[PDB]
Amino acid sequence: ALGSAMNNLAGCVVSPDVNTAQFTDCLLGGPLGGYFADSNAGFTETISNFNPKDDWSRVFLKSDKIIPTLYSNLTQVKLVSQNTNDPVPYAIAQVIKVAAMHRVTDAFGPIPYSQIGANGEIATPYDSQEVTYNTFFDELNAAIATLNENSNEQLVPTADYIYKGDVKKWIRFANSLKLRLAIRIAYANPVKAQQMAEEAVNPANGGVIESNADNATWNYFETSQNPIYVATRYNQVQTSDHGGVPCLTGGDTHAAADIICYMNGYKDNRREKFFTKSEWAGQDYVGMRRGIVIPELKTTGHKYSGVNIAPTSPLYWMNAAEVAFLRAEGQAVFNFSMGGTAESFYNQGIRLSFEQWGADGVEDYLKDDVNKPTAYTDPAGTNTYQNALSNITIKWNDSADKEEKQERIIVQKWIANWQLGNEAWADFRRTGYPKLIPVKENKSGGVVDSEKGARRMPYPLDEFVSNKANVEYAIANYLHGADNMATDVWWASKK
Numbered sequence: 001a002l003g004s005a006m007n008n009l010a011g012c013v014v015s016p017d018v019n020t021a022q023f024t025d026c027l028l029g030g031p032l033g034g035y036f037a038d039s040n041a042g043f044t045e046t047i048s049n050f051n052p053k054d055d056w057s058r059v060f061l062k063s064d065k066i067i068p069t070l071y072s073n074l075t076q077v078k079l080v081s082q083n084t085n086d087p088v089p090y091a092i093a094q095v096i097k098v099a100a101m102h103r104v105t106d107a108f109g110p111i112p113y114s115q116i117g118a119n120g121e122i123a124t125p126y127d128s129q130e131v132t133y134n135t136f137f138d139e140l141n142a143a144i145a146t147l148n149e150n151s152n153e154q155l156v157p158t159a160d161y162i163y164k165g166d167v168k169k170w171i172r173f174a175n176s177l178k179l180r181l182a183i184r185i186a187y188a189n190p191v192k193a194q195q196m197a198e199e200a201v202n203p204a205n206g207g208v209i210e211s212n213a214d215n216a217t218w219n220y221f222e223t224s225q226n227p228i229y230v231a232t233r234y235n236q237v238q239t240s241d242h243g244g245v246p247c248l249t250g251g252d253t254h255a256a257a258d259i260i261c262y263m264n265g266y267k268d269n270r271r272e273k274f275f276t277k278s279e280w281a282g283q284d285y286v287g288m289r290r291g292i293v294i295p296e297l298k299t300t301g302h303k304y305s306g307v308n309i310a311p312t313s314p315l316y317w318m319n320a321a322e323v324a325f326l327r328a329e330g331q332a333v334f335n336f337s338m339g340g341t342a343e344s345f346y347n348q349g350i351r352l353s354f355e356q357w358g359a360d361g362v363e364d365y366l367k368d369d370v371n372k373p374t375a376y377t378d379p380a381g382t383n384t385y386q387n388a389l390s391n392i393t394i395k396w397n398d399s400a401d402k403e404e405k406q407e408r409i410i411v412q413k414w415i416a417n418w419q420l421g422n423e424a425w426a427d428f429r430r431t432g433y434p435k436l437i438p439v440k441e442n443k444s445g446g447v448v449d450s451e452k453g454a455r456r457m458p459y460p461l462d463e464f465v466s467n468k469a470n471v472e473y474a475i476a477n478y479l480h481g482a483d484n485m486a487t488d489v490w491w492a493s494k495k
């Protein structure tokens with residue numbers, strides 16, 4: 001029972017169910033984080049163009065594959081810990097719980113949390129986002145304390161397809177997630193942010209992820225196939241329809257223009273690891289723009305670079321590079337005591353990412369104080385954006401002001417977090433970085449800003465049917481703005 005439940009919990013971060021992951025990570029996170037571009041011309045209502053149907057935007061709260069599955073399996077792990085007088089299984093499950101649920105509040109703002117039912121029923125009162133985040137810290141802190149007290153114990157190997165029962169790795173992931181969430185709240189509650197960040201990296205509490213061997217990843221989907229691979233490939237042009245040579249760029253989702261403009265300008269050797277080659281004459285990497293009139297796949301859409309992912313690829317939750325860049329930002333931008341210099345952490349993050357992806361050339365990359373992001377010259381000539389996306393160069397400049405340091409950190413963190421679109425979206429909303437290509441075909445009817453982009457998802461329509469009083473209370477008291485995509489969540493308070 002324990003092992004089945006734990007692998008079911010793991011599937012509540014990025015779902016193994018293709019169409020669920022398609023909505024949460026391929027159509028929501030990827031485009032809103034500047035990584036992926038919607039690429040089916042029949043998608044006339046999308047998240048990325050700011051006119052989504054409810055069935056696209058609601059998924060984090062309404063899919064039975066997310067909250068009901070999470071809570072039903074959490075209850076089964078709690079049962080094991082109760083029955084056995086052993087708090088370690090439930091501590092690990094709580095880390096997974098926070099990994100799953102922070103994505104949900106980060107999408108909507110206020111959500112049901114403290115009063116969610118044992119089977120994941122959300123027809124309950126909502127918590128403010130501030131209360132939800134404080135609860136995440138309490139939950140992680142309890143789990144971290146339990147695991148440190150039992151740091152010599154181990155789960156059976158099949159009870160954990162993330163870390164094979166190694167409690168010391170779970171401690172590092174829990175502190176890393178705590179650090180992620182602490183930096184998330186660095187503008188909205190700087191006092192709490194500093195305390196949580198500094199605790200997370202204090203060696204007395206067990207450490208953070210410092211090596212790629214300790215990255216938080218999941219591969220045992222129970223379906224045989226990575227769901228992002230499948231979702232991005234849907235509708236790929238067929239070989240006998242592509243002149244007799246298979247198409248390799250995917251179907252419904254392509255690589256975004258934004259990240260490719262940065263990486264082309266930086267001559268970045270991770271490009272071949274991240275992207276398929278484009279079919280545009282003379283151009284190895286060209287992304288499709290986000291927030292456009294989407295072209296027909298068979299004519300031009302299939303020529304843009306795709307996502308380079310395999311059916312057997314793992315799903316990422318958090319990597320070591322991110323932890324390094326969190327510490328760089330904590331030190332450089334917020335003056336937190338992160339255990340080292342910002343320069344040291346920035347360079348470590350770049351080195352971790354190049355190592356992770358097996359890319360050569362990191363030493364020249366680290367020293368590059370010349371090359372800049374490109375503009376976006378659309379080879380189709382329809383959706384060009386003529387300005388360079390930024391002038392920020394790679395090499396660390398310890399003399400720079402805090403705004404430039406933040407930009408530089410976030411750009412490299414963003415590149416290293418390729419495929420973690422929900423995380424990129426959170427960082428973009430919090431910081432304004434990286435500087436992206438504005439939306440061109442803004443279908444929001446004047447509501448959403450083409451530069452600031454989507455700030456949240458609107459609440460599910462069904463909440464007004466099955467949970468009216470509680471969702472309306474949340475809107476009136478906790479949301480601090482209209483229930484639409486333009487209203488910022490609580491932590492997005494940078495001036």
Ligand SMILES: [Mg+2]
Nearest residue numbers: 247248302303
């Ligand atoms: Mg093709």
